[PDB]
Amino acid sequence: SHGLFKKLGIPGPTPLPFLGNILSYHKGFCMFDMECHKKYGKVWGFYDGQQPVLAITDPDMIKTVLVKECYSVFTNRRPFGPVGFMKSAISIAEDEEWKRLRSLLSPTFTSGKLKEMVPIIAQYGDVLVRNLRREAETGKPVTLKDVFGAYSMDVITSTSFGVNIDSLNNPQDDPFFLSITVFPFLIPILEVLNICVFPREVTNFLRKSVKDFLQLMIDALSDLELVAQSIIFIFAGYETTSSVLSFIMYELATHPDVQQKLQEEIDAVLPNKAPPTYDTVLQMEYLDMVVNETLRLFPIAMRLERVCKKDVEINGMFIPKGVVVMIPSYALHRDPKYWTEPEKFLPERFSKKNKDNIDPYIYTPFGSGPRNCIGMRFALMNMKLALIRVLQNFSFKPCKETQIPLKLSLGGLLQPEKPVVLKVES
């Protein structure tokens, strides 16, 4: 099975038997992606065990895969297991089942239902300053992913349901997945065992805690299929939110000529520390020119993936069935051929002046097509609503223990090695 890329004339790193190419993950997904983009060119192939992965960099191919032929050939993501009752969640569902669930869950992030969420988010952005004013008034670094996490936690529990808890009460919230890929034929076994990658007690904790996004559901849909959708929203709305807030907070304290220039637009549209509304936010381009630049540097999903469900010949290339087409986000976001000095944080790539020479099938940090980030709008609203309410009250400087430059986690997920700490000044 490992001669599929020798056959189709597609170059690649040679795969070891049984293991495939995962031996080269020893530095991380991202570094293995940038590596081969230099090694073999515009299209290369590798194997995740016996699993052949096609890496595409041509932005038309990318468009064909995510948008044009999404509904036809590349509908679903890579098989990930074992999960259990979670097989119904949207980021996991496939074919016809996903269609019924992406329709049903689209109503949540409209321009009308998101504006309904700015005044309720205006409540926890003040539990964020008051919990960041206690660790500022005293000389002491600050662990951004706790206070932002405590924040991002509070936001998601309400933007969808309605529960309210100051995450200082500490409400709730790659060791073995390594074997998934060399033993994907073992996933069918683990299922008939109820066994979960999500420990069966984080789920039983919520196999009853479920029994607004909650409203707009029961308002056709099932009930064990109702539990799962709350889960994903809770993870993404917490983890992804806090993670990037601290990611930008690092690039603001280590680039203070940008931290002040962003603080000089915040006191222009919102004078006298004016609370942010749905519309004042969308005005601010630098806050966008930054958020889009950090996400151009730290794409929190690194790669997009789709599963080629039949023989196709997109943009000149015969693609066989069962292959995983993989858009290597992190590697493009930092490609020289498309970004000058790409290691450098320069929110002026997303200036209206320059955001013309910017191809949205290279910078896709929320994906694209009918299966793109369904929370992208809610995400880009939830972040800047906290980015404003914090760059009005505090300016951030390096610490003594602040990881400069920031070491990305060479393991799996995209996070820093040591957590981002920063000195906060009022």
Residues near a copy of itself (CB under 8 A) are 175-176, 179, 186, 189, 192-195, 199-201
Q: Which helix (H) or strand (E) holds 397?
A: strand 395-397
* Residue 269 near residue 283, CB atoms below 8 Å: yes
Shortest Å distance, C-beta 187 to a copy of itself: 11
Would you say 180 or 217 has its CB closer to a copy of itself? 180
Q: Which is nearer to ligand HEM, 4 or 324 (CB)?
A: 324
Rounded (5°) CA angle 135-139-141: 65
Question: Which of the listed partners (a copy of itself, ligand HEM, none) does 52 bind, with a CB threshold of 5 to 8 Å by partner kind?
Answer: none
Query: Residue 171 or residue 199: which is nearer to a copy of itself going by CB?
Result: 199
Is 373 labelled a binding residue? yes
Nearer Cβ to ligand HEM, position 46 or 233? 233
Binding mask 91-120 for ligand HEM (x = CB under 6 A): x----------x------------------
Tokens matching residue 325: 């087409």
Short-list 425, 379, 421, 377, CA closest to 400: 421
Q: Which does 147 bind (CB under 5 to 8 A by kind): ligand HEM, a copy of itself, none?
A: none
* Whole-number Å distance between alpha carbons of 26 and 10: 23
Contact in structure between 389 and 125 (CB atoms under 8 Å): yes
Question: According to CB under 6 A, which residues from 54 to 73 bind ligand HEM?
Answer: 66
Among 378, 421, 423, 424, binds ligand HEM (CB under 6 A): 378
Cis amide leading into 398 (omega within 30): no
Q: After which residues is the chain broken (C to N over 2.5 A)?
A: 173, 211, 219
CA distance linking residue 135 with residue 274, whole number of Å: 23
- Which one of residues 30, 281, 379, 391 is an interface residue with ligand HEM (CB under 6 A)? 379
Q: How far apart are CA 160 and CA 133, in angstroms?
A: 28
Cα of 279 vs its chain's centroid, Å:
25
- Cβ atoms of residues 336 and 197 within 8 Å: no
Closer CB to ligand HEM, residue 4 or residue 325?
Answer: 325
> Which of residues 5, 32, 44, 233 is near ligand HEM by CB under 6 A?
233
Q: Is 365 in the site for ligand HEM (CB under 6 A)?
A: yes
> Residue 393: which of ligand HEM, a copy of itself, none does it interact with, CB under 5 to 8 A by kind?
none
Going by C-alpha positions, the residue among 241, 259, 244 that lies closest to residue 423 is 259
Looking up tokens 């690194």 gives: 302
What letter does residue 51 receive in the DSSP assignment? E
CB atoms within 10 A of CB 51: 20
Q: Which of 59, 256, 320, 367 binds ligand HEM (CB under 6 A)?
A: 367
Tokens of residue 254, six digits: 């280590």
The SS3 assignment for 319 reads strand
The amino acid present at 9, given as its one-letter code, is G
Question: How far, in Å, CA of 282 to CA of 111, rounded?
Answer: 12
199 binds, among a copy of itself, ligand HEM, none (CB under 5 to 8 A by kind): a copy of itself
Answer yes or no whether residue 328 interacts with ligand HEM by CB under 6 A. Answer: no
Does 372 interact with ligand HEM (rule: CB under 6 A)?
A: yes
Site map for ligand HEM, 284-303, x if CB under 6 A? -----------x----xx--
232 touches ligand HEM (CB under 6 A): yes
Contacts with ligand HEM in 300-319 (CB under 6 A)?
300-301, 304
Per CB under 6 A, 342 contacts ligand HEM:
no
Residue 73 CB, nearest distance to a copy of itself (Å)? 34
- Rank residues 236 and 253 by Cβ distance to ligand HEM and give the closer one: 236
Contact 17, 176 (CB under 8 A): no
Q: Is 149 in the site for ligand HEM (CB under 6 A)?
A: no
Phi, psi of 379 (to 5 degrees): -65, -55
- CA 347 distance to own-chain centroid: 19
Query: Residue 76 interacts with ligand HEM (CB under 6 A)?
Result: no
Q: Which residues bind ligand HEM (CB under 6 A)?
A: 66, 90-91, 102, 232-233, 236-237, 240, 244, 295, 300-301, 304, 365-367, 371-375, 378-379
Residues making up the annotated binding site for heme are: 373
